[PDB]
Amino acid sequence: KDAWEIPRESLRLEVKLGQGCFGEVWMGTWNGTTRVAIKTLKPMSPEAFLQEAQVMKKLRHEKLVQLYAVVSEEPIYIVTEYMSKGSLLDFLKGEMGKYLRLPQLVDMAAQIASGMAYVERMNYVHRDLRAANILVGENLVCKVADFGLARLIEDFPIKWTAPEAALYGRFTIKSDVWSFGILLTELTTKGRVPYPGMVNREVLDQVERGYRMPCPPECPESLHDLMCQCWRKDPEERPTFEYLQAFLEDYFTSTEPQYQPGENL
Ligand SMILES: Cl[C@@H](Cn1ncc2c(Nc3ccccc3)nc(SCCN3CCOCC3)nc21)c1ccccc1
Secondary structure, three states: OOOOEOOHHHEEEEEEEEEOOOEEEEEEEEOOOEEEEEEEEOOOOOOOHHHHHHHHHHOOOOOEOOEEEEEOOOOOEEEEEOOOOOEHHHHHHOOOHHHOOHHHHHHHHHHHHHHHHHHHHOOOOOOOOOHHHEEEOHHHOEEEOOHHHHHHHHOOOOOOOOHHHHHHOOOOHHHHHHHHHHHHHHHHOOOOOOOOOOOHHHHHHHHHOOOOOOOOOOOOHHHHHHHHHHOOOOHHHOOOHHHHHHHHHOHHHHHOOOOOOOOOO
8 A cells, every 4th residue: 555554552642632523633642652643534534545645745844844654544643753742722721821921922933934934835835823823842853743734624713814814814924924923922922812712803994094003011022023023014025034044043143142031022
């Protein structure tokens, strides 16, 4: 069959970590040694499910969650590297939140940008970029997840969605850039919901009129400016992820060489 295929007895499902309507997510072990994450399809979605993990077989990048193995006959199991810290959202909101300062948060943003730069140059579109869908491991490693497979399973995050995508279905790498700007506010507020106190309908009406979130407290204006570039009305005017990565990687030398730590950032 396939070199990614593994026998069912090589997988040991240990701790259940997530529940869905179409399947489950587990932590476990592969070949008795390798710590892994496991998704199951409930025999729910068609056998088009495997067309998505075929993408995961094609895509390979240090900042994308790495496919390890598949069980492609029903009931299907998908195995990837294990991200010990869960979602970025949970990480930012939990015990680690209060310790993270701008240097850590901007480095995490740089990693996410690097993953998204790979997506960009491969001509993919994520469609649901936000902190809930980023995974965190040891040493503050951050990775983009199974965006294609997650998109298939998901068939409303309009606070993270560019107006042209939310209104006219134009989902592009550029609407992903918009989402990345929103993700930057998640980082700098340590996981707070964007547009605080606004309902979905308010957000749509306001963003249309040109409203953009203001500079978060203690966030340098230069980083809020970067967010504003990501939130440009014209998608083609928004920066590339290649530009975002470079800007974020060089931030504390080229952009804020006089940064001083504060109470929260
Ligand atoms: Cl399971 C692990 C996070 N993680 N690591 C890999 C991985 C992973 N890799 C993968 C595996 C098969 C097919 C596609 C992708 N997928 C996921 S999706 C689970 C997200 N879920 C985590 C629990 O809370 C609700 C949201 N989460 C993952 C985790 C560790 C500690 C706490 C919570 C989750």
